[PDB]
Structure 1
Amino acid sequence: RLVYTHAQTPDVSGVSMLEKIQQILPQIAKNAESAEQLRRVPDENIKLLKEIGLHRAFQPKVYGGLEMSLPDFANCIVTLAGACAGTAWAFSLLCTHSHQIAMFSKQLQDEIWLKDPDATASSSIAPFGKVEEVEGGIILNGDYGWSSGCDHAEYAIVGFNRFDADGNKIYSFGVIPRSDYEIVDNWYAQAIKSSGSKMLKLVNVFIPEYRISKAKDMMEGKSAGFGLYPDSKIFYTPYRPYFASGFSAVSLGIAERMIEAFKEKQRNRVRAYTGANVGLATPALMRIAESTHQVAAARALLEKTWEDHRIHGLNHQYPNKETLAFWRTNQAYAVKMCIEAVDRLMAAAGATSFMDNSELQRLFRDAHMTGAHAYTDYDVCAQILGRELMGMEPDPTMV
């Protein structure tokens, strides 16, 4: 039988990653409140998550990685996000960066993983840095904001534009060691506080050529790492869909948790003004139902999309323009549905739910943040899909 309201535990003889997550979930849940005040992921959480081996989800097998399918991974992040969104958000990023790093040169991957098999990277991908072309690579300078999980990473993946005979942008990623940049703690946010999305400061950072890859090359199987793992079901695929798969995952985790949290707290609810046992009133029942349907629909779309990713990777098939536009955008629609489902419950949660001692308030804030990421912006995504559906050339104004 299928499950509409959450992830189905894969019945494979042994313990699946999802079951392993499920066991440590209560611990993650209890750190949530102190995680929020810490403004970064508690060490205990990283320890637990690394212990079960989730960070090796998309690490090549040759280094001791698992090469988990996208669906299985995403479902781990969804479940995790229910306990602490920020932990799930940051840890998802640390995980999915490994998938990108697998498309860089064998030389870089050896450098990261032979040395330390448990090493991970955080990122700052918006190309704000100033790049001087020196020989053997580049010198990069700039303030690189929003690096989720940066405190727990050994490296950072940093985005920049190089240029051209013609002066056209070459969007590129460099991988730099923790020693090359300062973490500037300016992370004071109103949602997903525990993600520790601090800024990375780069001062005359040299990046050699072998630690630089073109974004387009990693979208199209033309990067230095292409072909390294010919038995892999996950590396013959564009980097970005995996890169950014976690946001919507987190959004779904939060929304599914919201429905549970709301149900728990509603049962016993009494009207301040009249003194009525009011938890099972029709309006509240109908809200619970609709939000349940809305996120179930969101889940079905995501599950279908993830399946589409999986099938493509299996066949080493790169997506065509149309499926790529769907992969790029479906997650944003999912995020928008989830936020609707959360808001519908929050609107009926009452004043008590806005107190610091109510989990609902945290879920609400975290849910909204998931739709604030540049990748989950639906105005942008509606335009990207719309243009593709009408056979128009892409608008370079957005990506």
Structure 2
Amino acid sequence: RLVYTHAQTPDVSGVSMLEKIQQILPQIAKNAESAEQLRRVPDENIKLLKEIGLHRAFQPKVYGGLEMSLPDFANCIVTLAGACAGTAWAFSLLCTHSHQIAMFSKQLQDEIWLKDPDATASSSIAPFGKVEEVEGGIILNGDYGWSSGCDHAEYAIVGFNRFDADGNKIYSFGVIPRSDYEIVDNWYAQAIKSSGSKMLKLVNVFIPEYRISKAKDMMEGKSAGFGLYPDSKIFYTPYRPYFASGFSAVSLGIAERMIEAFKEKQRNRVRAYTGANVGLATPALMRIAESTHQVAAARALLEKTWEDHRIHGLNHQYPNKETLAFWRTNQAYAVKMCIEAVDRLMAAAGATSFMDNSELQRLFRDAHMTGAHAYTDYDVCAQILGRELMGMEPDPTMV
């Protein structure tokens, strides 16, 4: 029998990553409050999650990785997000970054992992950096904002633009060691506080050519690492859908938790002004129902989208324009529904739900934060998909 309201446990001989997550969820949940005030992932959380080996979800097998299918991984993040959004978000990123690193030169991966198999990377992909072409590579300078989990990373992946002959943009990534940059703690946010999305500062950082890949190359299986893992079900696939797979996941995790948390607080709710017993009043019930439907519908769409990714990966098959448009955008619609579903409940939650000591207020905030990311902006997404459906050239103004 299927389950509509949450992740179904892959019954497998040998216990699943998702069960392993489920056992440690109470601890995560209890640190949630002190994680918010810490403005990063508490050391305990990292240690627990790494202990179950989650961070090696997308690490190639040759280095001791699991190579989880997207669905299985997504669902761990969703489940995780239910307990601490910021943790789930940050940790998702640390994880999905290995899937990218896996497309770089064999030499780079060897450098990172043969040395330390538990090493991970945070990122800052927005190309703010000023780049000088020296011989052998580049020198990069810049302030690189928004690096979730950067405190717990040994490397960072960093985005920038290079130019060819007709000084055209060549969008590239560089992997750099933790010693090459300072973490500046300017992370004072109002949602997903626990993700530690501090900013990386880069001063005359040299990056050799072998730690630099073209984005386009990693979208189309032409990067230096292509063909390295001929048996893998997850590497013969565009880098971006994976890396960005966390946002919607976290968002959905929040939504499903909101429903549960709202239901718990709803049962016993009294009317301040009259004293009457009001937890089972029809309006409340209808909201719980509709939000349940809405996130169930969102989970269906994400589940179907993830299956699509998995199937493609299995078959070592790069998607076409249309499927690519859908993979870029369905997640944004999912995120959008999930927020509608959180809002519908928060709106019936009453004043007490906005107190610091109430969980709803944090879920509500975090939920909204998931729709503020560049990759989840639905205005941009509607235009992307739309243009594709009418068979129009893409707008280079968005991506």
- Which range, TM-score by smaller chain? over 0.9
Once residues 113 and 319 of structure 1 are traced to their aligned partners in structure 2, the CA distance between those partners, rounded to angstroms, is 30
Deviation, structure 1 residue 57: 0.2
Once residues 340 and 14 of structure 1 are traced to their aligned partners in structure 2, the CA distance between those partners, rounded to angstroms, is 38
Once residues 256 and 86 of structure 1 are traced to their aligned partners in structure 2, the CA distance between those partners, rounded to angstroms, is 16
Structure 2 SS opposite 1:176: strand
Match of 2:264 in 1: 264
Once residues 382 and 33 of structure 1 are traced to their aligned partners in structure 2, the CA distance between those partners, rounded to angstroms, is 36
Moved over 6 A (4+): none
Deviation, structure 1 residue 175: 0.1
Once residues 382 and 251 of structure 2 are traced to their aligned partners in structure 1, the CA distance between those partners, rounded to angstroms, is 18
Deviation, structure 1 residue 363: 0.1
Deviation, structure 1 residue 301: 0.1
Q: 1:112-153 CA distances to partner (integer Å, 9 max, x unpaired)?
A: 000000000000000000000000000000000000000000
Deviation, structure 1 residue 154: 0.2
Deviation, structure 1 residue 211: 0.0
Once residues 285 and 67 of structure 2 are traced to their aligned partners in structure 1, the CA distance between those partners, rounded to angstroms, is 42
Once residues 7 and 202 of structure 2 are traced to their aligned partners in structure 1, the CA distance between those partners, rounded to angstroms, is 40
Once residues 259 and 60 of structure 2 are traced to their aligned partners in structure 1, the CA distance between those partners, rounded to angstroms, is 37
Match of 1:278 in 2: 278
Once residues 367 and 203 of structure 2 are traced to their aligned partners in structure 1, the CA distance between those partners, rounded to angstroms, is 35
Once residues 14 and 131 of structure 1 are traced to their aligned partners in structure 2, the CA distance between those partners, rounded to angstroms, is 49
Once residues 173 and 164 of structure 1 are traced to their aligned partners in structure 2, the CA distance between those partners, rounded to angstroms, is 15
Structure 2 SS opposite 1:202: strand
Q: 1:184-205 CA distances to partner (integer Å, 9 max, x unpaired)?
A: 0000000000000000000000
Structure 1 SS opposite 2:37: helix
Once residues 140 and 392 of structure 1 are traced to their aligned partners in structure 2, the CA distance between those partners, rounded to angstroms, is 36
Match of 1:360 in 2: 360
Deviation, structure 1 residue 5: 0.2
Match of 1:317 in 2: 317
Deviation, structure 1 residue 167: 1.1
Once residues 64 and 30 of structure 1 are traced to their aligned partners in structure 2, the CA distance between those partners, rounded to angstroms, is 31
Deviation, structure 1 residue 242: 0.1
Q: 1:91-115 CA distances to partner (integer Å, 9 max, x unpaired)?
A: 0000000000000000000000000
Structure 2 SS opposite 1:158: strand
Deviation, structure 1 residue 15: 1.2
The 5 Å alignment of 1:101-120 reads 101-120=101-120
Once residues 114 and 6 of structure 2 are traced to their aligned partners in structure 1, the CA distance between those partners, rounded to angstroms, is 37
Once residues 190 and 398 of structure 1 are traced to their aligned partners in structure 2, the CA distance between those partners, rounded to angstroms, is 26
Match of 2:246 in 1: 246
Segments of 5+ residues of structure 2 without an aligned counterpart are none
Q: 1:304-333 CA distances to partner (integer Å, 9 max, x unpaired)?
A: 000000000000000000000000000000
Once residues 354 and 14 of structure 2 are traced to their aligned partners in structure 1, the CA distance between those partners, rounded to angstroms, is 42
Deviation, structure 1 residue 296: 0.1
Deviation, structure 1 residue 227: 0.1
Match of 2:372 in 1: 372
Q: 1:35-79 CA distances to partner (integer Å, 9 max, x unpaired)?
A: 000000000000000000000000000000000000000000000
Once residues 159 and 91 of structure 2 are traced to their aligned partners in structure 1, the CA distance between those partners, rounded to angstroms, is 20
Once residues 10 and 294 of structure 1 are traced to their aligned partners in structure 2, the CA distance between those partners, rounded to angstroms, is 24
Deviation, structure 1 residue 208: 0.2
Q: 1:368-389 CA distances to partner (integer Å, 9 max, x unpaired)?
A: 0000000000000000000000
Once residues 222 and 185 of structure 2 are traced to their aligned partners in structure 1, the CA distance between those partners, rounded to angstroms, is 36
Q: 1:229-266 CA distances to partner (integer Å, 9 max, x unpaired)?
A: 00000000000000100000000000000000000000
Say yes or no: does 1:212 pair with 2:215: no
Structure 2 SS opposite 1:38: coil
Once residues 126 and 29 of structure 2 are traced to their aligned partners in structure 1, the CA distance between those partners, rounded to angstroms, is 32
Deviation, structure 1 residue 349: 0.1
Q: 1:339-384 CA distances to partner (integer Å, 9 max, x unpaired)?
A: 0000000000000000000000000000000000000000000000
Match of 1:93 in 2: 93
Structure 2 SS opposite 1:39: coil
Match of 1:225 in 2: 225
Deviation, structure 1 residue 83: 0.1
Match of 1:346 in 2: 346
Segments of 5+ residues of structure 1 without an aligned counterpart are none
Once residues 284 and 79 of structure 1 are traced to their aligned partners in structure 2, the CA distance between those partners, rounded to angstroms, is 25
- Taking only the aligned residue pairs, the percentage that are identical comes to 100
Once residues 395 and 238 of structure 1 are traced to their aligned partners in structure 2, the CA distance between those partners, rounded to angstroms, is 20
Deviation, structure 1 residue 7: 0.2
Deviation, structure 1 residue 164: 1.5
What is the alpha-carbon root mean square deviation over aligned residues?
0.2
Once residues 308 and 54 of structure 1 are traced to their aligned partners in structure 2, the CA distance between those partners, rounded to angstroms, is 23
TM-score (ref. length: structure 1): 1.00
Match of 1:162 in 2: 162
Once residues 264 and 358 of structure 2 are traced to their aligned partners in structure 1, the CA distance between those partners, rounded to angstroms, is 12
Once residues 237 and 113 of structure 1 are traced to their aligned partners in structure 2, the CA distance between those partners, rounded to angstroms, is 22
Match of 1:193 in 2: 193
Once residues 230 and 276 of structure 2 are traced to their aligned partners in structure 1, the CA distance between those partners, rounded to angstroms, is 65
Once residues 278 and 382 of structure 1 are traced to their aligned partners in structure 2, the CA distance between those partners, rounded to angstroms, is 40
Structure 1 SS opposite 2:200: strand
Once residues 136 and 46 of structure 2 are traced to their aligned partners in structure 1, the CA distance between those partners, rounded to angstroms, is 36
Structure 2 SS opposite 1:122: strand
Structure 1 SS opposite 2:159: strand
Once residues 142 and 258 of structure 1 are traced to their aligned partners in structure 2, the CA distance between those partners, rounded to angstroms, is 39
Deviation, structure 1 residue 14: 1.8
- Count residues in correspondence: 399
